[PDB]
Symmetry: C3
């Protein structure tokens, strides 16, 4: 049988791995998944800088499944409020069907 859940993705600088993991757990999520990633973006806020000739930068990608949209929004808000202006970061939400 199915249950509709929300999937929050946070892609951010690899150096924020432990800090963002703590926000997710402190907010009451049941868990999280994290993957190593790389990327480029257009906000140009990376804490360690960017060179003139761009190349892919080191990131992590979190995926957090939540039983309510409310909880996904809360985690997203906390990460963005704390880090979005000072660190490269992008975030999005969608829905999936959990078992």
């Amino acid at each position: 049988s199915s249950q509709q859940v929300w999937k929050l993705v946070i892609i951010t600088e690899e150096i924020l791995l432990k800090k963002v993991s703590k926000i997710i757990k402190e907010a009451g999520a049941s868990g999280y998944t994290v993957l190593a990633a790389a990327g480029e973006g257009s906000r140009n806020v990376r804490s360690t800088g960017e060179p003139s000739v761009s190349h892919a930068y080191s990131n992590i990608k979190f995926e957090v499944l939540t039983a309510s949209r409310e909880l996904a929004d809360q985690i997203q808000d906390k990460v963005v409020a704390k880090y979005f202006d000072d660190y490269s970061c992008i975030t999005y939400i969608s829905t999936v069907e959990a078992l």
Copy 2:
């Protein structure tokens, strides 16, 4: 032109890489993608144990595209029936548009 397909995700202990790959292929999927991952969860069933002070554990993330919901459900069922009680594992389904 587009075709609606289903995307099954399985996130599980890294030690199940070969066993789960075999279920996916034996069920008739056209392929699979797998990524290294880490994570934490709340079922507390990891086959290799967890310590009192939790940290991220080693996982793999599979993504399997299927032409029917029926096939995604079958693969999901087979993995869950065989491994969910004895190994850390979470699974979800959504739809995407293949070319």
Copy 3:
């Protein structure tokens, strides 16, 4: 507040990392995320070959968020037209909610 965006995924041979990154950026995307991956598929076109007894092959997974479906389709088209016949490659699109 929310904005509906499109998410284009391209999973392809690891050797195409720089060539596909250039298409994404030359098309005007605001960024991209890329992850190391492995997989198997059924088209059997891998540029470096496949053995009789299959095993997972080395890939990369791109995710590209776009503000229009039009731009996702354009990037997808350019990658497919250039590489799909000569290199292992699969691609799909869905929608997500960006902040």
